[PDB]
Design a protein around this nucleic acid. Structure first.
Ligand SMILES: [Zn+2]
Ligand SMILES: [Zn+2]
Lengths: 61, 836, 114
RNA sequence: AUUUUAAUAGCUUCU
RNA sequence: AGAAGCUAUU
């Protein structure tokens, strides 16, 4: 069930490219780092906060 | 106690750690020179410094640590930092190593003075490292035979050749870029238009190596054979650090076409091959032909000259120009998701917590700086000056591994193109692809272009692009796209030998041998061979493609061309080596709309990359064996045959000038029996006599760590290396596959099985949206099931369920498709049966 | 015909790029030669009338191109345009310590030969 | 904008 | 039973 978090992040970040988020270079780098750290996370608890944070950035629009 | 010694004696001869009135007359004769001091003798000698830097071991580097503190290279608390010695992790170690280069330089000058005094007094002798001080003072002049004054001949083969790798490690000749060769004085402002430096090269040679008993060629175009090229190019890499970086590269000459002034390249100033000149130049011309016009559009001469200056602070490499009005950036997409497969997987008892199989392989998104940071990894490529006596013996033994193939040149109608529609490179990609050029320029034009390449030099630009591939790590990867002009010439030159290696079976190089139909079993049986005490010791190369020294890349290219002894003259062969260096080793790389200078390393697009990697892989493995045999004490060996091998190996290295075809045969037979190799590019699995390695007669993992330090400028950890003691289970890993012994009928056969997480990761994530519907493309999962079938034979029950999940999912797709052959579990059993 | 069109495609590029070469330096430097042989690396270092500088951070910017005019390659350069990584024009007032976090690095600095 | 090498599976026609 | 083309997989 830990991998369920990583699968949700992968589909979540791919949505941003569909809505053309790459214009903001600094914002694009920030979400890439958060997504990469989620995929490299060893403890499941740490990935929860970034997934919500990544979800919040999508909801900013 | 244990000090480094360089001994040649009646039976013992090696560079190891042996615990320790005639000369008075000699002392009077040699007292005149200031080099001769035993007072003011440093606890450590130049042999100890070269020993520690050549045989480097973690945790046993106390001698290296004490020298650095004693001569004020750094403070003691520098060592408390973890992995301080690692070049990749701690680049500041280079600054620490470069702080005793001036002590090395003063030792070189004091050697010539000592040689001059010994010549003027009529004395003959051999110079060894352990007879010097770290200051540079000389002593230990016992076994010197008197003769008439003015005719003494020093022997300086052992002293200079062993000391060669330290000259570039410590950057000893940095003081020669200062006024009056003094560090406090400012830099020398060489004229921007100077490119020859031939007179200074001879002055540099005559000041540091005055009695190197071999003719030095500042321009390698005047050499005799390929063994002369390696000797003369080795000295050039040390002398190319002094001169300004702007001098090297293509040389431009003003020519006229139809009365219109033009800028072209009529030569090249290599850091290794000196300065060479073209032979077919036309000051005044007319209507241009296809072959001549093609060359005019490939050289970086006019692309750089028509752009604008560039100053890039991100990269530490050399910036040439910027063809574009602004820098361009590109990012990387994350991988797509197969929700249908994931939902099916989680339903069938998978992805539960506390399961030994999980999801670990992903596609990673990258930002714009990743492309330039990956290019910036070329900072690990450093100028390496190799031991030339070792390189001259090793290249012959390495060449004997390649004497069972047929090479030579082929015409343009004997060339096979694997995939035509890939790319034509820069700037050719703007007009078409590799198919356009092949079917437009005729057969006669292709041979003339190959003929023109044998009398001239063609520089060319190769582009860099990004990769969209699955990996566990988030590191970016870049692939080099070579131009169509460079590929055709290399195909006619190398395809005859490359196709033969991919067709030969049962050899050391196992490129082109399939793992299916019992292929894995056959290769594993071959490498086991007749080894007395088998053991497996596969290893890995840290930063292989970026840290390759240029000396070993030139040596590898000469071996590949050793098969042209009939079809090509020596003049024609040199102009082929010159082309390869100007198109692979050092060239202008189009890394993001701006021209840079590639210091070195392999290129992905080079056709002979995998095969040249094998030569370099064997070269390091051969080198590691000769170092282990020489570093072994000659008085502790019990086998008399090895002792004679250990004694003659030293003689064939330092006291000889011609290839000894008899001892090369004995050494090749010795390696083939006790050190059996299975080589495929960087990967390597070795079956070695464990009894010999425990005594030091063959290479170990430690011997690979030492060689990689001084001949590759990289540090190898114990993580990516492995060792297995029982042959019932095969290699721990080879080409990312594991092995186990399973029953098959009445036979036990080895089978390769991949990582369970890698197989699941491939199914879950696809790098293309169109691949979401597996109904149209069922074949993707069938191929994964073929790879994953051996998992059913694993003792772990959770491992075997991956294939059943793949097999069950194949059936579910067949319900909508409509046959049973794909769902048949015996279809995947046939692919690992000896009957093809 | 495939070889004919590609022939015209690249021969023009050899002729339409001679013109793009800076004429105020074409005669000034391209005409000048010591003995008809000069290295290629130094050709843009003196013939180019335009310069592009890419700056990673503020510390490098103040250490290399501080002020409106900066000296590099033994020549004086006058800044013309500064553009951030987003391809937006940036005024010289914004480049400071206070606004450094707000800036979108890297920055592209364009100069002109004196 | 997407390189090189080798191996396999599938499908498409030629006798 | 071999050729040749395309696609996919490692
Ligand atoms: Zn020579
Ligand atoms: Zn040939």
């Amino acid at each position: 069930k830990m991998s369920d978090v990583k699968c949700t992040s992968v589909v979540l970040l791919s949505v941003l490219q569909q809505l053309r988020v790459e214009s903001s270079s600094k914002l694009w780098a920030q979400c890439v780092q958060l997504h990469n750290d989620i995929l490299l996370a060893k403890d499941t608890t740490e990935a929860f906060e970034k997934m919500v944070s990544l979800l919040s950035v999508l909801l900013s629009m | 106690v244990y000090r480094a010694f360089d001994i040649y004696n009646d039976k013992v001869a090696g560079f190891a750690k042996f615990l320790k009135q005639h000369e008075e007359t000699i002392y009077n004769l040699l007292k005149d020179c200031p080099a001769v001091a035993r007072q003011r003798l440093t606890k450590y000698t130049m042999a100890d410094l070269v020993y520690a830097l050549r045989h480097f071991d973690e945790g046993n580097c106390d001698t290296l640590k004490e020298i650095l503190v004693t001569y004020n290279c750094c403070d003691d608390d520098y060592f408390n930092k973890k992995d301080w010695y690692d070049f990749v992790e701690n680049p500041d170690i280079l600054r620490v190593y470069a702080n005793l280069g001036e002590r090395v330089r003063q030792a070189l000058l004091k050697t010539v003075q000592f040689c001059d005094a010994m010549r003027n007094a009529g004395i003959v002798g051999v110079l060894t490292l352990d007879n010097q001080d770290l200051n540079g003072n000389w002593y230990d002049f016992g076994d010197f035979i008197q003769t008439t004054p003015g005719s003494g001949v020093p022997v300086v083969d052992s002293y200079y050749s062993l000391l060669m790798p330290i000259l570039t490690l410590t950057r000893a000749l940095t003081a020669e870029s200062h006024v009056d060769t003094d560090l406090t004085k400012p830099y020398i402002k060489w004229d921007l238009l100077k490119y020859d430096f031939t007179e200074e090269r001879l002055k540099l040679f005559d000041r540091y190596f005055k009695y190197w008993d071999q003719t030095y060629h500042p321009n390698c175009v005047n050499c005799l054979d390929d063994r002369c090229i390696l000797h003369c190019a080795n000295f050039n890499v040390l002398f190319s650090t002094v001169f300004p970086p702007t001098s090297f590269g293509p040389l431009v000459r003003k020519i006229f076409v139809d009365g219109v002034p033009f800028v072209v390249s009529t030569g090249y100033h290599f850091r290794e091959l000196g300065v060479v000149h073209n032979q077919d130049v036309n000051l005044h011309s007319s209507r241009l032909s296809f072959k001549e016009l093609l060359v005019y559009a490939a050289d970086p001469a006019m692309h750089a000259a028509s752009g604008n200056l560039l100053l890039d602070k991100r990269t530490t490499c050399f910036s040439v120009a910027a063809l574009t009005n602004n820098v361009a950036f590109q990012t990387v997409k994350p991988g797509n998701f197969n929700k249908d497969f994931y939902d099916f997987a989680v339903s069938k008892g998978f992805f539960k917590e506390g399961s030994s199989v999980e999801l670990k392989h992903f596609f990673f998104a990258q930002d714009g700086n990743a492309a330039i940071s990956d290019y910036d990894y070329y900072r690990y490529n450093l100028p390496t000056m190799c031991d030339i006596r070792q390189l001259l013996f090793v290249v012959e033994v390495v060449d004997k591994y390649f004497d069972c193939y047929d090479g030579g040149c082929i015409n343009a109608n004997q060339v096979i193109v694997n995939n035509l529609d890939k790319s034509a490179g820069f700037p050719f990609n703007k007009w078409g692809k590799a198919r356009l050029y092949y079917d437009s320029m005729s057969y006669e034009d292709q041979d003339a272009l190959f003929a023109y390449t044998k009398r001239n030099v063609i520089p060319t630009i190769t582009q860099m692009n990004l990769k969209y591939a699955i990996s566990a790590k988030n590191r970016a990867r870049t692939v080099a796209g070579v131009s169509i002009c460079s590929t055709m010439t290399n195909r006619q030159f190398h395809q005859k030998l490359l196709k033969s290696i991919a067709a030969t079976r049962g050899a050391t190089v196992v490129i082109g041998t399939s793992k299916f139909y019992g292929g894995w079993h056959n290769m594993l049986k071959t490498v086991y061979s007749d080894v007395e005490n088998p053991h497996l010791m596969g290893w890995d190369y840290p930063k292989c493609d970026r840290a390759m020294p240029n000396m070993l890349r030139i040596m590898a290219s000469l071996v590949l061309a050793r098969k042209h002894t009939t079809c090509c003259s020596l003049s024609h062969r040199f102009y082929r080596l010159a082309n390869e260096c100007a198109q692979v080793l050092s060239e202008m790389v189009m890394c993001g709309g701006s021209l840079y200078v590639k210091p070195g390393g392999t290129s992905s697009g080079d056709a002979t990359t995998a095969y040249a990697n094998s030569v370099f892989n064997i070269c390091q493995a051969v080198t590691a064996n000769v170092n282990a045999l020489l570093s072994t004490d000659g008085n502790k060996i019990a086998d008399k045959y090895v002792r004679n091998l250990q004694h003659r190996l030293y003689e064939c290295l330092y006291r000889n000038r011609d290839v000894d075809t008899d001892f090369v045969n004995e050494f090749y037979a010795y390696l083939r029996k006790h050190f059996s190799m299975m080589i495929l590019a960087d990967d390597a699995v070795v079956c070695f006599n464990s009894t010999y390695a425990s005594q030091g007669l063959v290479a170990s993992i430690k011997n690979f760590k030492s060689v990689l330090y001084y001949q590759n400028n990289v540090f190898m950890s114990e993580a990516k290396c492995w060792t297995e003691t029982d042959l019932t289970k095969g290699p721990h890993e080879f080409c990312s596959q594991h092995t186990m012994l399973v029953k098959q009928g009445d036979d036990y056969v080895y089978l390769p099985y991949p990582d369970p997480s890698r197989i699941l990761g491939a199914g879950c994530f696809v790098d293309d949206i169109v691949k979401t519907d597996g109904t149209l493309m069922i074949e993707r999962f069938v191929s994964l099931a073929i790879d994953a079938y051996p998992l059913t034979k694993h003792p772990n029950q959770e491992y075997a369920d991956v294939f059943h999940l793949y097999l069950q999912y194949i059936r579910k797709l067949h319900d909508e498709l409509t046959t049973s052959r794909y769902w048949e579990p015996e279809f995947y059993e046939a692919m690992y049966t000896p009957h093809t | 015909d495939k070889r004919a069109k590609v022939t015209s495609a690249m021969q023009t590029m050899l002729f339409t790029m001679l013109r793009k070469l800076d004429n105020d330096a074409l005669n000034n430097i391209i005409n000048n030669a010591r003995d008809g042989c000069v290295p290629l690396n130094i050709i843009p270092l003196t013939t180019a009338a335009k310069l592009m500088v890419v700056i990673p951070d503020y510390n490098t910017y103040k250490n290399t191109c501080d002020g409106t005019t900066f000296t590099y390659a033994s020549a004086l350069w006058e800044i013309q345009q500064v553009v951030d990584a987003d391809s937006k024009i940036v005024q010289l007032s914004e480049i400071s310590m206070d606004n450094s976090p707000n800036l979108a690095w890297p920055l592209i600095v364009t100069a002109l030969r004196a």
